[PDB]
Design a protein around this ligand. Structure first.
Ligand SMILES: [Ca+2]
Ligand SMILES: [Ca+2]
Lengths: 243, 239
């Protein structure tokens, strides 16, 4: 079967990352899903943005956790990438679910693991996913596997993906013990031994971030379940073999 | 009983990964040093962190593209300060020669990343055997496949599993790979990790801890060693 194309922060190569515009473009291109990052505002709302600070992607400055939802919505998350995207905002998580609707589109949600701690984010994320009936279409990932352990304990039916860059040997044992749906390794880790071990144990593989054509071709040949990429258009054409 | 491991020598005060930095670490009274090994074009073991010489030296390009003769022409001290002008990128042999017979630990990290170094594991074990550093060395790497090869070729050598990933119950992985220690990013040091490692006889070497307050928390947590850019502050804190 075809490898799934997961657009990293939407079609981030051509559209401002982590915006409804970028996620919508990924859907239009024919991607199988999207990868996104969730954080909490000061008043406890789930917003979609990668960095702990709004500095890089917006016309504002300061930590995401210091902004209230109303305040963070005044920022422009599109202008830093192009004049054509002026006025594009930092989405809430609800907006992403509302954009997709009932469509069969995978949403790989990453809970952050940096210096900024997010108390109660697991409970809030679980409630939001259940409210919009996205239980089956979501994979909750994180580099903080303790957070995923809490998610699995509080909502066993939700799928968790273990993100890692570390060059782990036989990581499928850990994955099975944590009841993880998938392993999300930095693409350098994708080698025959890892693929075979995961396939023999039913553990899915979602390598990231694959942007170069040569690496995309190797990931498809390796036979991974899905590829997280900033360039869905190029990967889709390779996966579809020009069709 | 908490080991002071100087990250790239006394890198806060002296240019990183240089004989001068390692010598300063020895003089301050540190228990050991942490360093990175890479191979030159002609297959010599040299001590430098980045896969390119750009940041720490006055040269440009990948380490693997420099032969030992060409890489010795570079100044690995001037960028840190004028006082250290002339300081060179050391070979692993020079580090062993500087330490000599002193009971000083050498945490050697085999570089992973993009560049592959064929036969680096064999060259490392032979160099350690040639200078009789078998018991004074802990070989670490983010690439655990490299450490699996080291454990097979030389079981007597201690291996440390480096990771930044927030791993749950990593001592199972440690025991499976016959690892002497786990080298976690120091954010990962929590009661659950320490207790689980101590119960299973796996040691902990958190990295890199530079803030005095963080050093205090690591000592109170009960870690076996602390990898730090500032050995002086940690040594004076233990005192
Ligand atoms: Ca992410
Ligand atoms: Ca290192």
């Amino acid at each position: 079967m075809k490898t799934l194309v997961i657009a990293h922060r939407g079609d981030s190569k051509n559209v401002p990352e982590n915006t409804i515009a970028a996620f919508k473009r990924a859907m239009e291109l024919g991607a199988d899903g999207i990868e996104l990052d969730v954080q909490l505002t000061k008043d406890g709302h789930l917003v979609v943005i990668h960095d702990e600070t709004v500095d890089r992607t917006t016309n504002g400055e300061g930590f995401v956790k210091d902004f209230t939802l109303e305040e963070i919505k005044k920022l422009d998350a599109g202008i830093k990438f192009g004049e054509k995207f002026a006025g594009e905002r930092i989405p809430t998580l609800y907006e992403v679910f509302e954009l997709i609707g009932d469509k069969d589109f995978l949403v790989n949600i990453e809970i952050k693991s940096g210096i900024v701690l997010y108390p109660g984010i697991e409970e809030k994320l679980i409630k939001a996913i259940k409210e919009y009936n996205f239980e089956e279409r979501v994979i909750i990932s994180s580099f903080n596997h303790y957070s995923l352990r809490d998610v699995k304990k509080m909502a066993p039916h939700l799928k968790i993906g273990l993100l890692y860059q570390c060059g782990l040997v036989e990581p499928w044992h850990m994955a099975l013990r944590m009841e993880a749906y998938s392993l999300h390794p930095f693409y350098f880790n994708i080698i025959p031994e890892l693929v075979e071990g995961c396939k023999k144990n039913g553990v899915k593989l979602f390598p990231w971030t694959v942007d170069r054509k040569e690496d995309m071709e190797r990931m498809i040949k390796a036979g991974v379940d899905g590829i997280i990429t900033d360039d869905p258009e190029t990967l889709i054409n390779l996966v579809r073999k020009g069709g």
